[PDB]
Design a protein around this ligand. Structure first.
Ligand SMILES: Cc1cc2nc3c(=O)[nH]c(=O)nc-3n(C[C@H](O)[C@H](O)[C@H](O)COP(=O)(O)OP(=O)(O)OC[C@H]3O[C@@H](n4cnc5c(N)ncnc54)[C@H](O)[C@@H]3O)c2cc1C
Ligand SMILES: Cc1cc2nc3c(=O)[nH]c(=O)nc-3n(C[C@H](O)[C@H](O)[C@H](O)COP(=O)(O)OP(=O)(O)OC[C@H]3O[C@@H](n4cnc5c(N)ncnc54)[C@H](O)[C@@H]3O)c2cc1C
Lengths: 461, 461
């Protein structure tokens, strides 16, 4: 039984960040990883998605070439070219992460970890036992797929994981889901030339975002050539002579349901949710609490119900983002190894960017949320909608929408929501201001930068 | 003698902003404009420059097309196409501004204003007299050109004004100056295909910016194909059989001077400075103080030395930016018409973006300036340099450099300097944070947005 100061199960965003900071603080740490280091973000998430987004962005920009004075660009996108380069880049990152661990003196234990029946919390990997007074579970999640029992032929569809394995651009693609992953995948497939449909259960995507954003985003998708199938769900999938045939039920409220077949589908992509990866951990041998989806339950300090067992990141089911896993893992290392007892992540005011076309940035409360926290009488919003100057000379157009949610007489800025060209890079510093408690006077008293889209946020009236 | 509550001389950025706010406050105002409304920014500045930058940006992006999986884009940029569209857009703005004035009930007096010999400050426009207890001079500036006496044939060169009149892309262009305007013009001409040289008196451009930026910017220019002629100045210009011939002196320190002729020059562009437009105002009839360049001198509240005469914007010679003229004109209207005596613009922490390739964003003190304000022992900087993920798959590369200047033990953020893709839209919100007095802990405690360039600023170590 090898003993360490800190054992980290999972070498993804949160596990690596926590292990590294712990080691800086003098901990003797080991990371257990059964697949590739870098976890979901590097291998099948953030990174490869962003490369594909940059690619889709080129496709759009190329539509405006002629408007800008240049000769019309003619063609066909070659999927394999970028796929090969994308894979190589991921390989480069994997090697870097590994080196980061080695330079820090963190041991990498390769294999699948499971808790043992032993009294003091102990794990087993490949027959060998390992123990530590502090064990972090950061095993992340996985894409959720429907059961063949509820949707027959569901297994003919792929998930976001399968998207990263594709080697050719699918001719006809149907994406099921209305969350950010669904939205991003649809936007990439469509821009690159797949005839794409997005199938949602209601009438708008991103229903948990501020309603200005969910409305605007749904419109932008339509405008970009994505067919949004509203109030629709899949009833069955079947393998035909030439691709797939999707049976769907459309049930507009106030109307009779109608069943439609979607033929000649090359790619059916389930983007319906994520499930936590806890199933094969033997949690129950320690009685560690989970919810009914399998999420590990923790307190504000990332503690599980068992002393010396912590959990961070996706496996916890809250705020499923790489930077949150990182920040939570770092704060936890400071608490454990630097004895900063008050060290923990504040889950409010976490900023998010959705890589749609144009991209979306949001931080803080939606208008409704502020309304429920402070009362209608105490909430005031400011918004603007305009066509960015980029489009002044183009036939193709996109819009930029921005909304600021203020509370109390002081007009404290409690939410910023926007969609538009440049919004992916614009959000970070306003997130800093929001975190600091800025009021609207603070924004207004900041001299604008002209001509930019960002200046609109400091000139709202 | 027609009397108003407020007379504004000049209908550009600051004059229009001030007149509009005054009118909201109940003032009966009139704007005197001898040319086009919108002034320098709209007609020959910010706006047309940005359109040309977006055009240059397309040119670059088109170099990466093939790397991204698409077929090589082949050609020749057509200057007149975009020129025509750019001019139309400016025409659209002129009409909008005019309408803005009318909707506000502001009178537009068309013509050139000059002060009169009259005791109570009075102006004359086209034979008629106008007076007000509050008169704002916001006449802006103009490009500076050398005297034929010092540089013979200087008048064969054009200025940034002339740049906006060009109808064809010059084959060979030489730009003289090392300030932002010079840098921007060179970057646009070069990206669009002119064989471009930038002639600077020292070894770096943007010498008043943080030295990380002046170094990086000079390198990026070289890397983008701009020939930077260091320690060089023009000695004479002459009209040859086929364009211009520029005689220059290069005087590297530690070396002997060497004279070179530059032949076959299509376009010689002077970007050496701006001069205030005060010369034809008859200021001296009121004894209004100017400095030796012709700038009107004002106090912190924009007052001139004469009661009821104010000046804002470029004519004052400080912080030559549209948003500063706007903010100063607005604060002044609140002071005059809302009786807010403490109403004035804080000239610290004004953010700037330079539309180079990649763009530059800066706010606050350079490292040297912090060093002189606080002492070397009290200044600590943080910086990073990296290749944006956009280039992971391209043969062409650009870099991103960021620097944070902190002061005192608390590490108050007193300066942010950066250059890189996306930096034009990234700056605004950090400018808000800087204005509010953020410290480095405030940045560090803000959860990152991944994957973006902006996240680097909140993860500096
Ligand atoms: C398509 C997609 C796009 C995304 N885009 C973004 C984005 O742009 N920005 C963003 O912020 N977030 C994005 N996310 C979310 C981000 O990827 C996750 O929030 C993040 O990866 C969660 O980190 P984690 O540390 O919890 O887990 P993970 O990164 O998943 O890592 C868990 C690791 O544990 C390993 N493991 C699991 N069980 C065991 C075991 N028993 N023994 C040993 N090893 C084990 C796994 O192999 C894995 O490497 C995206 C996600 C997806 C799916
Ligand atoms: C090439 C270039 C690019 C620039 N790019 C940017 C940029 O991207 N961002 C930025 O913030 N700033 C930029 N600037 C600077 C910005 O244009 C100026 O700071 C801004 O225009 C100054 O406003 P102003 O109100 O002082 O004067 P102006 O806008 O110049 O207006 C002065 C007005 O007064 C009129 N006038 C003058 N004298 C009289 C008289 N006697 N009677 C009647 N009317 C009169 C003039 O015709 C004019 O319309 C740029 C400038 C240039 C030259």
């Amino acid at each position: 039984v090898a003993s360490y100061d800190y054992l980290v199960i999972g070498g993804g965003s949160g596990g690596l960040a926590s292990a590294r900071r712990a080691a800086e603080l003098g901990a003797r740490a080991a990371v257990v990883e059964s697949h590739k280091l870098g976890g979901t973000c590097v291998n099948v998430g953030c990174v490869p998605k962003k490369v594909m987004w940059n690619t889709a962005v080129h496709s759009e920009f190329m539509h405006d070439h002629a408007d800008y004075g240049f000769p019309s660009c003619e063609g066909k996108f070659n999927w394999r070219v970028i796929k090969e380069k994308r894979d190589a880049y991921v390989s480069r990152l994997n090697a870097i992460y590994q080196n980061n661990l080695t330079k820090s003196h963190i041991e990498i234990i390769r294999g699948h970890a499971a808790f043992t029946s032993d009294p003091k919390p102990t794990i087993e990997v490949s027959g060998k036992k390992y123990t530590a007074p502090h064990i972090l579970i950061a095993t992340g999640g996985m894409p959720s797929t429907p059961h063949e029992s509820q949707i027959p032929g569901a297994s003919l569809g792929i998930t976001s994981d399968g998207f990263f394995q594709l080697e050719e651009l699918p001719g006809r693609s149907v994406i099921v889901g209305a969350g950010y992953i669904a939205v991003e995948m649809a936007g990439i497939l469509s821009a690159l030339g797949s005839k794409t449909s997005l199938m949602i259960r209601h009438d708008k995507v991103l229903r948990s975002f501020d309603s200005m954003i969910s409305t605007n985003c749904t419109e932008e998708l339509e405008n970009a050539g994505v067919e949004v199938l509203k109030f629709s769900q899949v009833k069955e999938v079947k393998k035909t002579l030439s691709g797939l045939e999707v049976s769907m039920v459309t049930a507009v409220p106030g109307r009779l349901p109608v069943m439609t077949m979607i033929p000649d589908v090359d790619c059916l992509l389930w983007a319906i949710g994520r499930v936590p990866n806890t199933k094969d951990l033997s949690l129950n041998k320690l009685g560690i609490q989970t919810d009914d989806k399998g999420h590990i339950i923790v307190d504000e300090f990332q503690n599980t119900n068992v002393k010396g067992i912590y959990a961070v990141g996706d496996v916890c089911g809250k705020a499923l983002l790489t930077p949150v896993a990182i920040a939570a893992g770092r704060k936890l290392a400071h608490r454990l190894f630097e004895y900063k007892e008050d060290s923990k992540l504040d889950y409010n005011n976490i900023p998010t960017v959705v890589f749609s076309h144009p991209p979306i940035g949001t931080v803080g409360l939606t208008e409704d949320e502020a309304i429920h926290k402070y009362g209608i009488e105490n909430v005031k919003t400011y918004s603007t909608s305009f066509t960015p100057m980029y489009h002044a000379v183009t036939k193709r157009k996109t819009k930029c929408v921005m909304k600021m949610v203020c509370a109390n007489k002081e007009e404290k800025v409690v939410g910023i929501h926007m969609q538009g060209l440049g919004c992916d890079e614009m959000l970070q510093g306003f997130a800093v201001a929001v975190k600091m408690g800025a009021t609207k006077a603070d924004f207004d008293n900041t001299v604008a930068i002209h001509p930019t889209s960002s200046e609109e946020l400091v000139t709202l009236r």
